[PDB]
Amino acid sequence: QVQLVESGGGLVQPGGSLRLSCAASGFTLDYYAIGWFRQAPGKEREGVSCISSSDGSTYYADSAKGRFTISRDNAKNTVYLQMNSLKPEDTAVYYCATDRGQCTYYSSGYYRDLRWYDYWGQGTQVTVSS
Amino acid sequence: ARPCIPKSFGYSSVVCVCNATYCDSFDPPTFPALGTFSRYESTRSGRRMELSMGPIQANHTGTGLLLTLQPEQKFQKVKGFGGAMTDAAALNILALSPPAQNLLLKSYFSEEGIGYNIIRVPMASCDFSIRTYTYADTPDDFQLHNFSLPEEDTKLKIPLIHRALQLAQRPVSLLASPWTSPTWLKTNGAVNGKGSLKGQPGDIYHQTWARYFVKFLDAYAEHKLQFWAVTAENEPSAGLLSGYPFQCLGFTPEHQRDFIARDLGPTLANSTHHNVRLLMLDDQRLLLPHWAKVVLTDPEAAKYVHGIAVHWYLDFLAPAKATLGETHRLFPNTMLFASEACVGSKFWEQSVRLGSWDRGMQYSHSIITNLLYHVVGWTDWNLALNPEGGPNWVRNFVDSPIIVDITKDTFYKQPMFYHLGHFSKFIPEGSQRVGLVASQKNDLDAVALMHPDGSAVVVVLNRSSKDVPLTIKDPAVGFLETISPGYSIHTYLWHRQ
Ligand SMILES: *[C@@H]1O[C@H](CO)[C@@H](O[C@@H]2O[C@H](CO)[C@@H](O)[C@H](O)[C@H]2NC(C)=O)[C@H](O)[C@H]1NC(C)=O
Ligand SMILES: *[C@@H]1O[C@H](CO)[C@@H](O)[C@H](O)[C@H]1NC(C)=O
Ligand SMILES: [Mg+2]
Ligand SMILES: [Mg+2]
Fold this sequence. Notes:
The complex is a heterodimer of chains A (about 130) and B (about 500).
Chain A (H helix, E strand, L loop, with lengths): L2 E5 L2 E3 L5 E8 L7 E7 L6 E6 L6 E3 L7 E6 L4 E6 L8 E8 L4 H4 L9 E4 L3 E5 L2
Parallel strand pairs in A: 2-11
Antiparallel strand pairs in A: 1-3, 3-8, 4-5, 4-9, 5-6, 7-8, 9-10, 9-11
Chain B lengths: L5 E3 L5 E5 L17 E8 L6 E6 L9 E13 L2 E5 L2 H9 L2 H12 L8 E6 L27 H17 L5 E6 L25 H19 L6 E3 L21 H17 L7 E8 L5 H7 L2 H4 L4 E7 L7 H10 L4 E8 L14 H16 L2 E8 L19 E4 L4 E4 L1 H10 L7 E7 L6 E6 L5 E7 L5 E7 L3 E7 L3 E7 L3
Parallel strand pairs in B: 5-19, 6-7, 6-13, 7-8, 8-9, 9-10, 10-11, 11-12, 12-13
Antiparallel strand pairs in B: 1-2, 2-15, 3-4, 3-21, 5-16, 14-15, 16-17, 17-18, 18-21, 19-20
Helix pairs in contact in B: 1-3, 2-3, 4-5, 5-6, 9-10
The complex binds a molecule of 2 linked components (NAG-NAG), 2-acetamido-2-deoxy-beta-D-glucopyranose and magnesium ion (MG) (2 copies).
The site of one magnesium ion (MG) has 2 residues of chain B, from loops.
């Protein structure tokens, strides 16, 4: 039973910070690479950040680079997304997903492929509003 | 599943014949129950990845060789296996009728075949091209406004890569490598010969050359293709050689170090392609560890370098501890990746040997050696060639695991194909090499890995003419009793839980 549960979402003001967590059960974090994604209303689902299980290397969307940090607590089997300097354009549902490869949305041959993410959480709403 | 149709051509083993309506293939992967193992067997006498199964035994009593799995001794994780989509490979594949094309692609990339998950893509022309070109041949265009992909990419290479991606069992990673820059960036003004970029790192020539990598990734992404990694230059030592016959661009290790630190690293990092990984060297392993020390001890280059790409060429039987082993020890967090391998020959010897078992054993011996010295992946050269070993505009013909005969709408799968498949089919990305110790000195080559799901895979190569009785011990399940026949390769799989 693979299960992923997002938490940490909520409402923040522009310029604020939030840390999302993706609690994994049914496998160990040295098995699956794990990716964070979002869907802003009116847009398709987009990658935010992914972390490889083979070597821990990290991947970022252009808009996440330098603002957001993905990390793992290996003792708690949890993947975190620290988001800083949030803006209203960051309002979205945020999802974590298991990868059949190593951060394939960024690294595999088909541009922005979502095909290899085989399990998805229900997501957590993040709202950035004054 | 369909079996091999064997054909002999005067060497010590057979090729398998495929055409528009027939190719040997596998049924979907099925794993047998705990307490049972699977065995895939290929032999010089003709067996081709033939499947049998057997019980794991609770005890073992003889003497004779024992190989003990050490699942707690963990080494490197595997990136993958694959080959190169050269102009020559693309032309040979597209020379087949469409049904034969798809059987070839399935042989390499699908679960009906051997599950390749790497494709190397030359940036513009190399020796396995029939036309000399780069992507920016309009001179003195330093902002690369006239950069563009020709039909070699947009009609041949890119559609074939997309067809492979759609057939693939596993996620495929693309790796790109340039051979030459535009000639107006070069000291000698030609694609070949001894020559490097003009000037020095940081200047207009080096900045434009780094920008060319970005334009290349830009252009492939417009065609919906994205890259896991690029190398800093194919075989940079070649362009240091007087009279070098085909496309090259020379870098000393110091030149590559400074090009990475001043131009390539920052240019890629400042672009939308900042996630693409950079591999240094892309050359033969006797340049190690020296090349790695020069580049990676400079912090301003090392912070951009993800790994080290190594070539195998005319060195399949040479040692690896002082090169690959020592480089791993010095830089244990910098992955080593074999990005190109092919069988060359002496000038008076034949380029293609249809059915050569020796060339198969060279591939599998090289792969095992690489894996035993921490290398995370292994990439073949041309995916397909014609029976001459071409086409190749300087006649630098070589062998390939698949040989296409356009006049018969037929392709031949060499022993090389199956020797590589004994690894690529059964070692998915993320598999971890684990320890395997022998009870006595022996002539076998062997490697053990654990799948991400926890199951075991062991490859056993016997390059001798003598059968070797053999037992594999796994403390979790028991003893695997088997024989390794002379001139054979076996892959063993079993569930551990
Ligand atoms: C493609 O290869 C297959 C396999 O060798 C050929 O099919 C065989 O043809 C011979 C001669 O008619 C028969 O004796 C076999 O029974 C066939 N095998 C099968 C599985 O059908 C086929 O003829 C080849 N196609 C062409 C155009 O040469
Ligand atoms: C590239 O660097 C410039 C100058 O440092 C900076 O202004 C720009 O935002 C950077 N762009 C990217 C995509 O990193
Ligand atoms: Mg050797
Ligand atoms: Mg070469």
